[PDB]
């Protein structure tokens, strides 16, 4: 699942979500 705002594939969801974190909108 690529982040849109960095693109990192991150392979699960949660982690996609987790990651939001690093910018949070
Ligand atoms: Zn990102």
Known sequence: YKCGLCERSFV???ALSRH?????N
């Open 12 to 14: 699960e969801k949660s």
């Open 20 to 24: 939001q974190r690093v910018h949070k």
